């Protein structure tokens, strides 16, 4: 993200959410969680069609 420095391998910068849902999420981990959810949704969307064709 533009808010981090170059060559930063710390867990916070690489997508570790040290907070909880009750506590709340910082913008960076919020963006990371959104990316993970988008990846999951895309995975299910492809998988349902693939398994349907395989079942047929």
């Amino acid at each position: 993200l533009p808010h981090f420095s170059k060559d930063d391998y710390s867990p916070e910068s690489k997508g570790f959410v040290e907070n909880s849902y009750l506590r709340g999420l910082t913008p960076q981990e919020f963006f990371f969680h959104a990316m993970g959810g988008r990846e999951g949704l895309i995975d299910t969307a492809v998988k349902t069609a693939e398994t349907g064709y395989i079942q047929r």
Binding site: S5, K6, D7, D8, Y9
Partner: protein, 115 residues
């Protein structure tokens, strides 16, 4: 070929050849002869691994980048408590995670490979 031999006349480069009778390798151009002794044992060098201390262009404006992280590593020569560090610029997984520190006072590049 670590270096390329260019013909003094014209601007083409020189092919490798052997004098046979003189038993001495000579470089010759094609547009013009330009025969010389060609006193260089190097005919071809092949490289298979990344060069040690590749670093980068390290321009004098390397300290003007706001995205470069800063540390407090001691400078070996000028003994400064400020520098900027970055990893190797090789674009594969074979390179290690060593850090190259560049001092903005004396422009000296020193690594953290204590080993």
């Amino acid at each position: 070929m670590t270096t390329f031999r260019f013909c003094r006349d014209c601007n083409n480069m020189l092919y490798p050849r052997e004098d046979k009778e003189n038993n001495r390798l000579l470089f010759e151009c094609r547009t013009c002869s330009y025969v010389e002794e060609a006193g260089s044992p190097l005919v071809y060098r092949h490289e298979l691994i990344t060069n040690i201390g590749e670093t980068a262009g390290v321009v004098q404006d390397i300290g003007s980048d706001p995205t470069l992280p800063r540390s407090d590593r001691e400078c070996p020569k000028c003994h400064s408590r400020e520098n900027v560090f970055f990893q190797s610029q090789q674009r594969r997984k074979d390179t290690s995670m060593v850090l190259f520190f560049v001092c903005l006072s004396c422009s000296h590049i020193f690594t953290s490979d204590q080993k």
